[PDB]
Subunit: 150 residues, 6 copies
């Protein structure tokens, strides 16, 4: 329902490059609600559990290594179709082919330095949210906005 959630995270490059506010504002302006937020330096295990679906992929080692090389800003947004929309708002894997207007499109040039992570399905979203957030960090008081929802 309009309660669907998604997990997003500003990777070390996004954080190091000062893009955290910019990214949060894009989702705030869109109408999505911030139900979880925190900065932390990812643990090797965290990183490996997060990207477990890519553990056989060659790039996994370097990916895990970079995701744990500095602070990360993890977050969860709520709203009608927020998982697929946040994905749209991010762009595509390769920042160079991400359309102007998306986050990777407007700001990135390297796949390994693609600024932000976004869950790709409600299934991976729920999976990833529990992975990064305990229940006491997620808001329950989500009063819908009559201005954004019919």
């Amino acid at each position: 329902v309009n309660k669907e959630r998604t997990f997003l995270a500003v990777k070390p490059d996004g954080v190091a490059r000062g893009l955290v506010g910019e990214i949060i504002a894009r989702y705030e302006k869109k109408g999505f609600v911030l139900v979880g937020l925190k900065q932390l330096v990812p643990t090797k295990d965290l990183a490996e559990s997060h990207y477990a679906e890519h553990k056989e992929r060659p790039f996994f080692g370097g990916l895990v290594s970079f995701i744990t090389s500095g602070p990360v800003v993890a977050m969860v947004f709520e709203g009608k179709g927020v998982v697929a929309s946040a994905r749209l708002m991010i762009g595509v894997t390769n920042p160079l082919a991400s359309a102007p207007g998306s986050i990777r499109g407007d700001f990135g040039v390297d796949v390994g330095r693609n600024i932000i992570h976004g869950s790709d399905s409600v299934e991976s979203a729920n999976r990833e949210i529990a992975l990064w957030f305990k229940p006491e960090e997620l808001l329950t008081e989500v009063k819908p906005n009559p201005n954004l929802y019919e």
Copy 2:
């Protein structure tokens, strides 16, 4: 001819959410000239008449009724191929399927609260403008910018 015009209106949600300036600014930046502007609390006649192509359609009631639920900023922009361009700049009926960079894409989530309306043809544009503005409310002498037009 660089004289084409289109009707656009910021709905109660867009107005209530403070997006009038952001929206007007997007069209100014693009090169379009505002030849009519005014805020108002639309009448049932205006609303039902404006959306007169969706009489049988269900949502018609809530639609007609929402648009009359509060302040609406109506306007007419003039420019070369402004009708089609403005809808492109708007996005698609559904805000979630609206591409990043578009008005609906950047700011909404509900097809019910999709923030703005823009004519969909020159005929509907002419019909709509005739409906929202008296002729003395529209500018007449609009000089063709040497930087925008060849």
Copy 3:
């Protein structure tokens, strides 16, 4: 009360320069509510009645002449201290001495081309509002925002 109103107007240069949305957005973001809005080419009388307090000043003739040389976007905003705050947000007479962050400061360089007009007291505000707006163009339904007002 938090119902105090003020009159503002984007002069011909402001309009011609495509600054209308930018200006409206600055007041929308601040928390002030748009209770009246319209574009029109000022009549000589309108202009003279508006600036009647300066009718003896040398610059009056040229001022009246310019204010009637093109479209103007007239508006009224409502909120706690909106008259003095809009003034602050405009800057000072001379755009060159208006602080960065204000409207004239960020965008102007000539006194005669100082982009916008703002009422200077509640008295002149009420005076100017009736001057430019009939009662049926002013909103009465002003539901305060629990987010902006304690």
Copy 4:
């Protein structure tokens, strides 16, 4: 030393109004480094303790109570002279007297709903950070940018 830190929090109004990203972005742009961040619904203890210098003061009740009324985005920024700089970037207690360009100046009107809080000294900063964040929540190894610092 370029190691000074300050506590800042976006209040329920700023959060509810979608200003978290805009606010974080202002400090990022300035050159300050986020060394702590998290959203939460503050406890009465936290609120009353945080505003423990305004115990006798009247508004204390509503203050303590508003801050616990909904989600608050807390954070700690580090930089050279960040405590004084951040308050400057904030404005003044009163949003109407806050200069254009400042956070309060740009976005508020009510002293009650003045959107953000920022420490007012290094002592209050240290006291406040100790209060909102556990030490494991703050970054430790913060590299001094060659472009920002000499």
Copy 5:
């Protein structure tokens, strides 16, 4: 190819006249591309004609050359991975009206002859173009790849 690829971009006379130079450069900077060359000049007819050589016969040519030389132009060169194709994607398509919201031509233009900016269309055209508008000395040689941008 490599992270040192380069492309030639120019803010046409209309773009400079409308005050879009800073907006355009900011877009390329925010994206992570490095400015290795930059200068404002009023192009000569010979520079213009040589630059648009490929359209030497096409009918809109004369008017094009005339306009390009009718006022100041801001020329520049940006370097980064796949910058030629990326810069084009950011500009839009020939007609501003057909250009997507988010692209430069999409966000600010409405007429083909006043489409704000030019971007090289290939590494080869880019290398030729850079050569025509900049003497080697005007181009940066040292460029520390940013670790935040490139792996």
Copy 6:
């Protein structure tokens, strides 16, 4: 004085490295000032020393000259009514920390030695400065005053 006054501004190495060139130029364009000169270069020690001549003896001098020449700089000249004083107002004060929100140094800096930009401080220093960094040919001569900007 006149609507043709001019001033010399330069995006220091830190400003260029942080990607603030477009933001800064946009600010001056939005204000109504016209760009009559512009180019990116890595200053010579002699240009730097001559430019900051007035501080030739002051202790922070050596470090200053060293930094100004440690990377690319974007130099430019803007023209408009009272542009010298206006441009300074827009930059802020020497210390970025003391600079007002809204000013360039106020919005982006935090250290005096990394204060992003330089603006001439008088018509006389501006004329001298323009002369040192730009050959006459690089400067625009024709400038149609904009009727929307000037009465």
